[PDB]
Design a protein around this nucleic acid. Structure first.
Length: 809
RNA sequence: GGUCACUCUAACAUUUAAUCACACGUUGUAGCUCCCUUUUUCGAAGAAAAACGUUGUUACAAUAAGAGAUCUCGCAAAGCUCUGUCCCUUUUCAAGGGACAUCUUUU
DNA sequence: TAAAATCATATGTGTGATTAAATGTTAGAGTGACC
DNA sequence: ATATGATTTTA
């Protein structure tokens, strides 16, 4: 049986074939495949949303500028609007603003929009942003703070010294309703004084700007995610059909445990309770204890009888909304309407946009009723039952049948279904395990059954369950153990578990659940398994340690090489997110504002104004020395320089020899990822050209290679007098022999400054190099440096020296 | 009589995927402003200036680098229909099987 | 000294919304394969 | 985990 030892980073395996199953003789080969503060896709999604919001504000302000130009407010050129936007917004309530003052006010009320609530219509502990909009909305009605700007310049700037939010404080923020109110009042008051551009057309368009935001879920969105039995769409939970399915499932499975006997409801009892929770908001247990003439003990539960069996919350929510607003007559007609009642929960759960909800109910509910439901009702669940299959399977379970009986009356390894596995870790592990399985099938045929025993334990168990079921139920051209079972009898440990997982049976697992007795399924364990996986020896040293029973080795037995996933993607993070100042980049330095709460004395020693402002440097050095070089404890209260100004962050210089120009070419950021490295030789010397992601994106092929003691401009240039060996990606199989020694392994890192490389041992033997990684390896005078190749399992070790310099982009 | 797997229901815990917004923060540029290097003019202390650094605060612009049709992609993943490069079976070619991607898809 | 191995230091963040999907456990109902 | 500058030891 394939002894797959699953995992989120590695898949160890150990092949075994047994006669009569039961007692096994000996395995064939072993292997480990090692592939690779949360999922990297979360970073991509957050960056994507940030890009979308940034460009949407770009567009919104541009559109506002065009609108203002059309009214002859914003003259074509001369777009240097006043800076004192908040003060001018305050002044507009009492004086007339000019053309450009008003233009700045409008273009600024479009930028800082506010906060528009997007909660459900399910009306009736505040955080920071919400507790700031309310605490200012409760101050805007003091009649002394007529508008958010007036409150800002009369309360915020007066006491706190700033208007905008700062340093993670979510006070000083306002709701979009308050700013729209300011828009309206400003327009009206400017009409009172005579602003020519107070056109209410402009106000309507500007409210459209300051209020429009895309709905989060628009149309098929939910449908696009609901897709994963059968095939019809899974019904909503708040649908009368699904609600009655839950009710009948409970009632039929509501066995009565009385007098030590389990008795189902006879048809009389259920007919009594069939449609009972419809005339009451909740069917309590004591309510059942009366209608059915209970002999004073249910089935489960926990005389505190006041529990809930089944409340059709959907049914009672639609009424208490429609029963109000004097819409009694429609509900009475709608009290049955089983299709109609079903179709309102199918819409309010599948579509949330008011337009999209009104579309699904194609006038089938009166628009006066539809308005009330749109304004007061929301449904957001979904059940695991096709509604089409509900109309046929629910009637049978009315009282006479059960789910199992009702359904019966209605009666190599393929690729992992990606759409059904929307989690990159699980999908990656499953696909690499599938590749390993297909490889071992090719190398051995179908060995036997399969044996699998494995902060993200959720992902691991998703992988295990899905792999077991997929393997067992899929074929083309069976055992789920656990760690406790494995423990009974470097990175190579997954092989040992593999063997132990392969030498396992369902009988021992059941005996474990019922729990010396465990035997040895081989002639000898210690020497056999010690050299089989660990201490790799191709017979020989095995044979010297295997004097007795010289029946060892197989037609293909060889030492184990841990194959590692090749990463050859050319996309990634172009540059680091800390943007700096490149105005002094020619000096070789960057200038970044450093918060005082992180200004360690090391950082203070690189301040730009060290000697320009000597008194500042002296006092800052003293206070850091007074708190043991802990800026957080040192500058925990605002620092003050000579002259009464407050110091909150100081420009600090940093050593910048290599970087990326960003922000319109104004700033510089550190290199983030090195996608590929191109090797070259000239005069018996190995020179490596590093390539970064931003170079690939811009369509740039680097020329010069790494020179240790020189800067990027003075780096050795690869030209007609250089020989191109190959490219190098992270975790690439390379062979290195030098005058010092010989090492063969994986390549994961290039040191730009020193020029050294980081080569990693296949097994990550923690007694080898810098705990498994042979870091800082010099190859300038290397005898030979060749890129190898490896298969999924750790064999077919091929090498050449072919070349074609592949152009990025 | 047990163990385990699967199907449905409810409750709890956790995790993942997609979408809509907000508020900071960084950089650049102006206005005001805290300091403080240098150099002018009036001068026998001090004032008015100019360049550079730079503290705070307001406004405006960029917020990946970049690719496309006001508007869409761009840090993730899978794969072999199209494209490109390595590897094997039967100097080049042709078939078979596979590996990775700068190719396609999610989009 | 050139090249090489060692060490050492730094990485953008919090708030507020609509949803779907998966795993594990417990409670209830059941079928099916193996001890 | 990755990029890489500062510093020590080695050929």
């Amino acid at each position: 049986i394939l002894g797959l030892d699953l995992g989120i980073a590695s898949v160890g395996w150990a092949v075994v074939e047994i006669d009569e199953k039961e007692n096994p003789l000996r395995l064939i080969d072993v292997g480990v495949r090692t592939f690779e503060g949360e999922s990297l896709a979360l970073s991509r999604r957050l960056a994507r949303s940030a890009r979308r919001l940034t460009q949407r504000r770009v567009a919104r302000l541009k559109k506002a500028k065009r609108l203002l130009k059309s009214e002859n407010i914003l003259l074509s050129t001369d777009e240097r609007l006043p800076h004192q936007v908040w003060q001018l917004r305050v002044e507009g309530l009492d004086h007339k603003l000019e053309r450009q003052e008003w233009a700045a006010v409008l273009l600024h009320l479009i930028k800082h929009r506010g906060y528009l609530s997007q909660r459900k219509n399910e009306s009736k502990e505040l955080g920071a942003l919400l507790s700031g909009v309310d605490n200012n909305h409760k101050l805007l009605q003091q009649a002394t703070y007529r508008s958010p700007a007036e409150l800002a310049v009369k309360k915020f700037e007066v006491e706190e010294g700033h208007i905008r939010n700062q340093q993670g404080a979510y006070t000083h923020t306002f709701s979009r309703l308050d700013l729209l109110a300011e828009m309206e009042l400003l327009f009206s008051r400017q009409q009172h004084f005579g602003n020519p551009f107070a056109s209410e057309k402009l106000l309507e368009n500007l409210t459209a700007l300051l209020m429009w935001q895309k709905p989060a879920l628009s149309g098929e969105a939910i449908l696009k995610m609901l897709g994963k039995f059968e095939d019809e769409y899974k019904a909503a939970k708040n649908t009368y059909s699904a609600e009655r399915f839950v009710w009948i499932t409970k009632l039929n499975n509501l066995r009565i445990q009385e007098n030590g006997l389990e008795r189902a409801l006879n048809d009389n009892e259920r007919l009594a309770l069939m449609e009972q929770p419809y005339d009451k908001n909740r069917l309590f247990y004591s309510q059942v204890r009366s209608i059915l003439k209970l002999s004073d003990i249910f089935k489960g539960l926990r005389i505190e009888t006041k529990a809930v069996l089944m409340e059709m919350k959907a049914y009672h929510q639609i009424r208490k909304v429609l029963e109000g607003n004097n819409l009694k007559a429609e509900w009475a007609e709608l009290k049955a309407n089983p299709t109609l009642l079903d179709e309102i929960g199918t819409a309010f759960s599948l579509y949330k946009t008011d337009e999209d909800i009104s579309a699904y109910l194609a006038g089938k509910l009166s628009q006066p009723v539809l308005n009330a439901l749109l304004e007061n009702l929301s449904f957001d669940k979904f059940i695991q039952l096709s509604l089409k299959a509900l109309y046929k399977l629910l009637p049978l379970m009315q009282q006479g049948l059960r789910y199992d009986e009702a359904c019966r009356e209605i009666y190599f390894l393929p690729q992992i279904p990606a759409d059904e596995i929307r989690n990159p870790v699980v999908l990656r592990t499953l696909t690499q395990a599938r590749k390993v399985i297909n490889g071992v099938v090719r190398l051995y045929g179908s060995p036997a059954r399969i044996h699998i025993e494995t902060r993200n334990l959720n992902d691991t168990r998703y992988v295990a369950r899905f792999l077991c079921n997929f393997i067992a139920d899929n074929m083309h051209l069976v055992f789920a153990s656990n760690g406790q079972i494995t423990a009974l009898l470097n990175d190579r440990h997954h092989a040992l578990d593999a063997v132990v997982v392969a030498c396992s049976t369902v009988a021992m697992q059941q005996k474990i659940t019922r729990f010396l007795h465990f035997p040895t399924p081989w002639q000898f364990f210690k020497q056999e398994v010690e050299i089989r996986i660990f201490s790799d020896n191709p017979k020989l040293e095995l044979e010297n340690r295997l004097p007795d029973r010289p029946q060892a080795n197989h037609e293909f037995v060889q030492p184990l090489f841990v194959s590692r996933m090749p990463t050859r993607k050319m996309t990634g993070q172009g540059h680091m997110e800390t943007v700096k100042s490149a105005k002094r980049l020619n000096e070789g330095i960057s200038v970044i504002k450093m918060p005082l709460t992180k200004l360690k004395l090391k950082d203070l020693e690189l301040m730009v104004n060290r000697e320009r402002e000597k008194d500042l440097y002296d006092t800052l050095k003293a206070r850091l020395e007074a708190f043991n070089d802990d800026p957080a404890k040192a500058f925990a209260e605002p620092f003050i320089k000579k002259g009464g100004a407050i110091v909150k962050s100081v420009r600090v210089e940093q050593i910048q020899k290599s970087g990326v120009l960003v922000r319109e070419g104004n700033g510089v950021a550190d290199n983030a990822s090195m996608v590929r490295v191109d090797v070259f030789t000239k005069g018996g010397k190995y020179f490596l050209v590093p390539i970064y992601t931003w170079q690939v994106a811009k369509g740039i092929l680097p020329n010069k290679a790494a020179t240790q003691y020189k800067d990027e401009e003075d780096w050795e240039v690869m030209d007609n007098s250089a020989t191109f060996k190959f490219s190098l990606h992270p975790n690439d199989l390379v062979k290195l022999v030098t005058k010092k020694k010989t090492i063969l392994g994986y390549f994961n890192g290039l040191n730009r400054a020193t020029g050294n490389i980081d080569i990693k041992e296949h097994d990550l033997d923690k007694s080898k190099g810098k705990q498994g990684i042979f870091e800082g390896v010099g190859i300038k005078l290397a005898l030979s440096f060749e890129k190898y190749q490896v298969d999924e399992l750790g064999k077919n070790i091929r090498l050449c020296k072919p070349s074609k310099r592949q152009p990025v982009r």
